[PDB]
Every structure is written in C-alpha cells, then in structure tokens.
Coordinates of N, CA and C in Angstrom, one line a residue:
Chain A
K6 N 13.3 6.0 7.2 CA 12.2 5.2 7.6 C 11.5 4.4 6.4
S7 N 11.2 3.2 6.6 CA 10.5 2.4 5.6 C 9.8 1.2 6.3
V8 N 8.9 0.6 5.6 CA 8.3 -0.7 6.1 C 8.1 -1.6 4.9
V9 N 8.1 -2.9 5.3 CA 7.8 -4.0 4.3 C 6.4 -4.5 4.6
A10 N 5.6 -4.7 3.6 CA 4.2 -5.2 3.7 C 3.9 -6.1 2.6
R11 N 2.9 -7.0 2.8 CA 2.5 -8.0 1.8 C 1.4 -7.4 0.9
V12 N 1.6 -7.5 -0.4 CA 0.6 -6.9 -1.4 C -0.7 -7.7 -1.3
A13 N -1.8 -7.1 -1.2 CA -3.1 -7.7 -1.3 C -3.9 -6.9 -2.3
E14 N -4.9 -7.5 -2.9 CA -5.7 -6.9 -3.9 C -6.5 -5.8 -3.4
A15 N -6.7 -4.8 -4.3 CA -7.5 -3.6 -3.9 C -9.0 -3.9 -3.8
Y16 N -9.6 -3.1 -2.9 CA -11.1 -3.1 -2.9 C -11.6 -2.6 -4.2
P17 N -12.7 -3.1 -4.7 CA -13.1 -2.7 -6.0 C -13.3 -1.2 -6.3
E18 N -13.8 -0.5 -5.3 CA -14.1 1.0 -5.5 C -12.8 1.8 -5.5
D19 N -11.7 1.2 -5.0 CA -10.4 1.9 -5.1 C -9.7 1.7 -6.4
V20 N -10.1 0.8 -7.3 CA -9.4 0.4 -8.4 C -9.3 1.6 -9.4
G21 N -8.1 1.9 -9.8 CA -7.9 3.1 -10.6 C -7.6 4.4 -9.9
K22 N -7.6 4.4 -8.6 CA -7.5 5.7 -7.9 C -6.1 6.0 -7.4
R23 N -5.2 5.1 -7.7 CA -3.8 5.3 -7.2 C -3.6 5.6 -5.8
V24 N -4.3 4.8 -5.0 CA -4.2 4.8 -3.5 C -3.6 3.5 -3.1
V25 N -3.0 3.5 -1.9 CA -2.5 2.3 -1.2 C -3.1 2.3 0.2
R26 N -3.8 1.3 0.6 CA -4.4 1.2 1.9 C -3.3 0.6 2.9
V27 N -3.0 1.4 3.9 CA -1.9 1.1 4.8 C -2.5 1.3 6.2
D28 N -2.3 0.4 7.2 CA -2.9 0.6 8.5 C -2.0 1.5 9.3
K29 N -2.4 1.8 10.6 CA -1.7 2.8 11.4 C -0.4 2.3 11.9
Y30 N -0.2 1.0 11.9 CA 1.1 0.4 12.3 C 2.2 0.7 11.2
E31 N 1.8 0.3 10.0 CA 2.7 0.6 8.9 C 2.9 2.1 8.7
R32 N 1.9 2.9 8.9 CA 2.0 4.3 8.7 C 3.0 4.9 9.7
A33 N 3.0 4.4 10.9 CA 4.0 4.9 11.9 C 5.4 4.5 11.5
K34 N 5.6 3.3 11.0 CA 6.9 2.8 10.6 C 7.4 3.7 9.4
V35 N 6.6 4.1 8.5 CA 7.0 4.9 7.4 C 7.1 6.4 7.7
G36 N 6.3 6.8 8.8 CA 6.3 8.2 9.1 C 5.3 9.0 8.2
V37 N 4.2 8.5 7.9 CA 3.2 9.1 7.1 C 1.8 9.2 7.8
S38 N 1.0 10.1 7.3 CA -0.4 10.2 7.7 C -1.2 9.9 6.5
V39 N -2.5 9.6 6.7 CA -3.4 9.4 5.6 C -3.4 10.7 4.8
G40 N -3.3 10.5 3.4 CA -3.2 11.6 2.5 C -1.8 11.9 2.0
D41 N -0.8 11.4 2.7 CA 0.6 11.5 2.2 C 0.8 10.6 1.1
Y42 N 1.9 10.8 0.4 CA 2.3 10.0 -0.8 C 3.5 9.1 -0.4
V43 N 3.5 7.9 -0.8 CA 4.6 6.9 -0.6 C 5.1 6.4 -1.9
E44 N 6.3 5.9 -1.9 CA 6.9 5.2 -3.0 C 7.0 3.7 -2.6
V45 N 6.6 2.9 -3.6 CA 6.4 1.5 -3.4 C 7.4 0.7 -4.3
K46 N 8.2 -0.2 -3.8 CA 9.1 -1.0 -4.6 C 9.0 -2.4 -4.2
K47 N 9.3 -3.4 -5.1 CA 9.4 -4.8 -4.7 C 10.6 -5.0 -3.9
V48 N 10.4 -5.9 -2.9 CA 11.5 -6.4 -2.1 C 12.1 -7.5 -2.9
Chain B
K6 N 12.0 -0.3 -11.0 CA 10.5 -0.1 -11.0 C 10.0 0.3 -9.7
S7 N 9.2 1.4 -9.7 CA 8.5 1.8 -8.5 C 7.2 2.6 -8.9
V8 N 6.4 2.8 -7.9 CA 5.2 3.7 -8.1 C 4.9 4.5 -6.9
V9 N 4.3 5.7 -7.1 CA 3.9 6.5 -6.0 C 2.3 6.4 -5.9
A10 N 1.9 6.4 -4.7 CA 0.4 6.2 -4.4 C 0.1 7.0 -3.2
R11 N -1.2 7.4 -3.1 CA -1.7 8.2 -1.9 C -2.1 7.2 -0.8
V12 N -1.6 7.5 0.4 CA -1.9 6.6 1.6 C -3.4 6.8 2.0
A13 N -4.1 5.8 2.1 CA -5.5 5.8 2.6 C -5.6 4.8 3.8
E14 N -6.6 5.0 4.6 CA -6.7 4.2 5.8 C -7.1 2.7 5.5
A15 N -6.6 1.8 6.3 CA -6.9 0.4 6.1 C -8.3 0.1 6.4
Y16 N -8.8 -1.0 5.7 CA -10.1 -1.6 6.1 C -9.9 -2.2 7.4
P17 N -11.0 -2.2 8.3 CA -10.8 -2.6 9.7 C -10.3 -4.0 9.8
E18 N -10.7 -5.0 9.0 CA -10.2 -6.3 9.2 C -8.8 -6.6 8.8
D19 N -8.2 -5.6 8.0 CA -6.8 -5.7 7.7 C -5.9 -5.1 8.7
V20 N -6.4 -4.4 9.8 CA -5.6 -3.7 10.7 C -4.8 -4.7 11.5
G21 N -3.4 -4.5 11.5 CA -2.5 -5.4 12.2 C -1.9 -6.5 11.4
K22 N -2.3 -6.6 10.1 CA -1.9 -7.8 9.3 C -0.7 -7.5 8.4
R23 N -0.2 -6.3 8.5 CA 1.0 -5.9 7.7 C 0.8 -6.2 6.2
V24 N -0.4 -5.8 5.7 CA -0.6 -5.9 4.3 C -0.8 -4.4 3.7
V25 N -0.6 -4.3 2.4 CA -0.9 -3.0 1.7 C -1.8 -3.4 0.5
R26 N -2.9 -2.8 0.4 CA -3.8 -3.0 -0.7 C -3.4 -2.1 -1.9
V27 N -3.1 -2.7 -3.0 CA -2.5 -2.1 -4.2 C -3.3 -2.6 -5.4
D28 N -3.8 -1.8 -6.2 CA -4.6 -2.3 -7.3 C -3.7 -2.8 -8.5
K29 N -4.3 -3.3 -9.5 CA -3.6 -4.0 -10.6 C -2.7 -3.0 -11.4
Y30 N -3.1 -1.7 -11.4 CA -2.3 -0.7 -12.2 C -1.0 -0.4 -11.4
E31 N -1.1 -0.2 -10.1 CA 0.1 0.1 -9.3 C 0.9 -1.2 -9.3
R32 N 0.3 -2.4 -9.2 CA 1.1 -3.6 -9.1 C 1.9 -3.8 -10.4
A33 N 1.3 -3.4 -11.6 CA 2.1 -3.5 -12.8 C 3.2 -2.6 -12.8
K34 N 3.1 -1.4 -12.3 CA 4.2 -0.4 -12.3 C 5.3 -0.9 -11.4
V35 N 5.0 -1.6 -10.3 CA 6.0 -2.1 -9.3 C 6.6 -3.4 -9.8
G36 N 5.8 -4.1 -10.6 CA 6.3 -5.5 -11.0 C 6.0 -6.5 -10.0
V37 N 4.9 -6.5 -9.3 CA 4.5 -7.4 -8.2 C 3.2 -8.1 -8.5
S38 N 3.0 -9.2 -7.9 CA 1.7 -9.9 -7.9 C 1.2 -9.9 -6.4
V39 N -0.1 -10.2 -6.3 CA -0.7 -10.3 -5.0 C 0.1 -11.4 -4.3
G40 N 0.5 -11.1 -3.0 CA 1.3 -12.0 -2.2 C 2.8 -11.7 -2.2
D41 N 3.3 -10.8 -3.1 CA 4.7 -10.4 -3.0 C 4.8 -9.4 -1.9
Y42 N 6.1 -9.1 -1.6 CA 6.4 -8.1 -0.6 C 6.9 -6.8 -1.2
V43 N 6.5 -5.7 -0.7 CA 7.0 -4.4 -1.2 C 7.5 -3.6 0.0
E44 N 8.5 -2.7 -0.3 CA 9.0 -1.7 0.6 C 8.3 -0.4 0.3
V45 N 7.9 0.3 1.4 CA 7.1 1.6 1.3 C 7.9 2.7 2.0
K46 N 8.1 3.8 1.4 CA 8.8 5.0 1.9 C 8.0 6.2 1.6
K47 N 8.1 7.2 2.5 CA 7.5 8.5 2.2 C 8.2 9.2 1.0
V48 N 7.4 9.8 0.2 CA 7.9 10.7 -0.9 C 8.2 12.0 -0.2

C-alpha cells in the first residue's frame, strides 16, 4: 500500500516537529492512522 | 533519499486535496520542493 500526494508547506507551529499532515483519504490508501509513522520519497 | 515522519490529521481546508504538509527539514531530507509529488508508505 502507498499513496502519492503533492507537497505543501507546513503550518508554522508544525515546523521542526517531524510530522506530515495527511487527510483521511490518503491515510486509508496508505493503511495508517494518526500517530503512525510513514516513509516519504520523491516520485 | 527518504524521511520518516509521524502522521497527523489534515487541516480541514486541505481535506480531499491529496496534499501532504511537510516542513522544510523533511523536504530537505527527501529532496523535494513545495509542489513536488511524494510517495508515502507505512513504516
């Protein structure tokens, strides 16, 4: 399971926190819940 | 190049837009700019 998504800039309060904001549709495609860890690579 | 990050919930206005919010530190680790496409997989 994987998904492709377009990179957008972080919200300022998230900067430095090593989080990725992913909505419920992308999360379902990846098979993750909030709090899980994902690996991110360029397409 | 890749990076691992913790999944957090999307901002409401981003829901359905197939974007992933990634800060400049994670973007540097992946080698992407805002507007590039990334592939996301569970760790």
